[PDB]
Amino acid sequence: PRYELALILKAMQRPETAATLKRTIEALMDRGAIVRDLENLGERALPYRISAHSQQHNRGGYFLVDFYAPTAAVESMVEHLSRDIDVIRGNIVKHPLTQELKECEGIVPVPLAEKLYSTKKR
Amino acid sequence: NVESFASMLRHSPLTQMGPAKDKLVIGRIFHIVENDLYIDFGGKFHCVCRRPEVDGEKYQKGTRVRLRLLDLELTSRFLGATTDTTVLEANAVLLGIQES
Amino acid sequence: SNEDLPISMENPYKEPLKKCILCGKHVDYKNVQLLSQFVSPFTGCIYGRHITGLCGKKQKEITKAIKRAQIMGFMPVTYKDPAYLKDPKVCNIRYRE
Amino acid sequence: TKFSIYPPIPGEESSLRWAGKKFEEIPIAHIKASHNNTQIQVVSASNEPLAFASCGTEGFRNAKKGTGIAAQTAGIAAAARAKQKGVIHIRVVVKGLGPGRLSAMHGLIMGGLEVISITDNTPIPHNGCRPRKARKL
Amino acid sequence: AKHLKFIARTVMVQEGNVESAYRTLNRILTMDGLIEDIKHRRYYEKPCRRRQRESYERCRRIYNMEMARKINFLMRKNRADPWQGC
RNA sequence: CCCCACUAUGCUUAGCCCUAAACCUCAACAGUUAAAUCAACAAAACUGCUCGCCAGAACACUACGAGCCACAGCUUAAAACUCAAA
Numbered sequence A: 001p002r003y004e005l006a007l008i009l010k011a012m013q014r015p016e017t018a019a020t021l022k023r024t025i026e027a028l029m030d031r032g033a034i035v036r037d038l039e040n041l042g043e044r045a046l047p048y049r050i051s052a053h054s055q056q057h058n059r060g061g062y063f064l065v066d067f068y069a070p071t072a073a074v075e076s077m078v079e080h081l082s083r084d085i086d087v088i089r090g091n092i093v094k095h096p097l098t099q100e101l102k103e104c105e106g107i108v109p110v111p112l113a114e115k116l117y118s119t120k121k122r
Numbered sequence B: 001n002v003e004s005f006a007s008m009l010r011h012s013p014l015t016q017m018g019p020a021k022d023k024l025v026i027g028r029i030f031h032i033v034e035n036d037l038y039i040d041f042g043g044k045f046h047c048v049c050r051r052p053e054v055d056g057e058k059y060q061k062g063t064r065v066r067l068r069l070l071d072l073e074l075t076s077r078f079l080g081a082t083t084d085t086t087v088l089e090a091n092a093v094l095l096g097i098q099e100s
Numbered sequence C: 001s002n003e004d005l006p007i008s009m010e011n012p013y014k015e016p017l018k019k020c021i022l023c024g025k026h027v028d029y030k031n032v033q034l035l036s037q038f039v040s041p042f043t044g045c046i047y048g049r050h051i052t053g054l055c056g057k058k059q060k061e062i063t064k065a066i067k068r069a070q071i072m073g074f075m076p077v078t079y080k081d082p083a084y085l086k087d088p089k090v091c092n093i094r095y096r097e
Numbered sequence D: 001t002k003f004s005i006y007p008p009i010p011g012e013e014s015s016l017r018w019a020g021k022k023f024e025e026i027p028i029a030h031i032k033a034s035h036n037n038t039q040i041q042v043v044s045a046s047n048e049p050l051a052f053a054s055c056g057t058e059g060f061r062n063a064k065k066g067t068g069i070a071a072q073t074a075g076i077a078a079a080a081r082a083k084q085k086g087v088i089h090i091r092v093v094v095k096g097l098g099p100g101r102l103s104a105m106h107g108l109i110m111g112g113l114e115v116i117s118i119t120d121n122t123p124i125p126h127n128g129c130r131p132r133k134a135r136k137l
Numbered sequence E: 001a002k003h004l005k006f007i008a009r010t011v012m013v014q015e016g017n018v019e020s021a022y023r024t025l026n027r028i029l030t031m032d033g034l035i036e037d038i039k040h041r042r043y044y045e046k047p048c049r050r051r052q053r054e055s056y057e058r059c060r061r062i063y064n065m066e067m068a069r070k071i072n073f074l075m076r077k078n079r080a081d082p083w084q085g086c
Numbered sequence F: 001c002c003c004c005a006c007u008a009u010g011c012u013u014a015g016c017c018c019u020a021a022a023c024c025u026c027a028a029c030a031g032u033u034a035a036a037u038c039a040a041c042a043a044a045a046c047u048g049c050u051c052g053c054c055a056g057a058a059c060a061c062u063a064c065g066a067g068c069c070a071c072a073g074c075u076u077a078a079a080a081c082u083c084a085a086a
């Protein structure tokens, strides 16, 4: 299926960041993936302090990898991202573009509940 | 060739008026209690609008004003009730004197 | 018979059903600028549907997206990013007064 | 300009200065309003202890420590040790919903310290540890 | 811990009016619910007791909303008697 | 009952035990809102069909028997004496 790899890399230089992306994209191809795109969300400050591989990070690079792979490649690829020292945090989620949004006609008003108690003179 | 009741109701202004919400109608003041004014506008119930501060004196019995109707009958049902609660009056906004 | 009798018809004066601000839009977990509009600026707590004004289906998309962006390293938890403090206020909540 | 209630973020440059000092540089007054005590510790921006005071250190015992008069007394005693070290403006970080939560803040003002901000850092878990069982008193 | 300090639950003081800052801060924590949450977390509230409290708080809201909705609907009829004498 | 401290226990894994105010005390399916609305209360009153259960209180969530990884256990479950009420 089509997945989305939210990748947060360690703040490094251009030569080392491209070496990790390639090393990461080659791991997907080895597991049977058909990489489709490589978006860059830019380097920003992390929302909170992340501790990975005996290092306290405060900044990182955000990269998205849209790809297609078999179901068995997710568990094998999640174990590869845990051993890479330049990968702060990496999660694989089902691509949000493979989930059609049902059309909405608007908010349907709800009338107060009726006939909840007997019409007797208590 | 006597006119029926279904023909009166079809050609009546109220019927053709449509929903009263934000409709400009002409009222007639028929009763005044202190500042409050009781106004008829061709409906089942009256509306009670308060005397305008700018020109209070001009609003005497008979004065014809302009209204912006909201409801023709204030009703609502509340928790536990078997019927709607009505205050027996319409909701409208006074927009001054009909200056013919 | 008579031609002035009323006819069986659906209400033509009926007004279209109301829609939420996010009706027809895709709520992603990467859009932290939109997800920060429904959280408290001091505590980071997610607001309810009586404040946000969203529908049940879109209120749960913001909630699910906020929780996923928080644990992924996209969105804070204990506060709202100060960068998104000067964004349009859509929630019905006044603190100071 | 106007006045915002939100603290000035360090990164973005602002014009709010107190005695020529940025918001980050101002020392911090950590107040721990407990149910039976109230501890106050003044530190610098570089986490250097300047003053410490508590109801117990001011000669209160048992149920006299969980009052608003003992918390105020400890604030005056911590505002007198830090005022000798060059402290005027402080950032209050109150922790706890005890009786001496606001009374200690008044005592700091009765010692010559000016409060520029009030921060609440009361520990709230997102369920973590289980509290003691309810009591029948 | 791992978040930035002096952003969350922080209020700045205007013209040395600390009282207003504390009243403002205490109003932010009560509207968000922290105050009561901190008071219910002092002693463990058993699931059955917490489910009994959530129902009571939801049924009181429903009643108070409708009771208020009727008070605002009938306040138009709090004017002087127009038929004084009949 | 209030305070402190600490353990079995609560967690995981592998087996067992098989109980509850397991109660929304309101069986499953289909259907109706008319008629005599319905003792009361509670959560309005009924129809058709079927399975299960119950016939004064107490003795009795007992005894015996049987069965069960249960050996101070669970399930099923009487009677005698007794009362004229519950």
Ligand SMILES: CN[C@@H]1[C@H](O[C@H]2[C@H](O[C@H]3[C@H](O)[C@@H](O)[C@H](NC(=N)N)[C@@H](O)[C@@H]3NC(=N)N)O[C@@H](C)[C@]2(O)C=O)O[C@@H](CO)[C@H](O)[C@H]1O
Binding pocket: F083, F085
């Ligand atoms: C209408 N009769 C009521 C009834 O009286 C009963 C009452 O009957 C009692 C039996 O003798 C006693 O052995 C029996 N004792 C037992 N240990 N089983 C009593 O429980 C019993 N009372 C009762 N069921 N309420 O005493 C008896 C002599 C009585 O008068 C017979 O008719 O019960 C009495 C209260 O015990 C009431 O005062 C009477 O009004």
Ligand code: FES
Binding pocket: A104, A105, A106, A107, C018, C019, C020, C022, C023, C024, C054, C055, C056, C057, C058
């Ligand atoms: S109203 Fe259509 S999605 Fe919220």
Ligand SMILES: [K+]
Binding pocket: F023
């Ligand atoms: K029950």
Ligand SMILES: [Mg+2]
Binding pocket: none
């Ligand atoms: Mg233990």
Ligand SMILES: [Mg+2]
Binding pocket: F022
């Ligand atoms: Mg249950």
Ligand SMILES: [Mg+2]
Binding pocket: F027, F028
């Ligand atoms: Mg059955």
Ligand SMILES: [Mg+2]
Binding pocket: none
């Ligand atoms: Mg019996």
Ligand SMILES: [Mg+2]
Binding pocket: F061
């Ligand atoms: Mg038993």
Ligand SMILES: [Mg+2]
Binding pocket: none
């Ligand atoms: Mg037995």
Ligand SMILES: [Mg+2]
Binding pocket: none
């Ligand atoms: Mg036996």
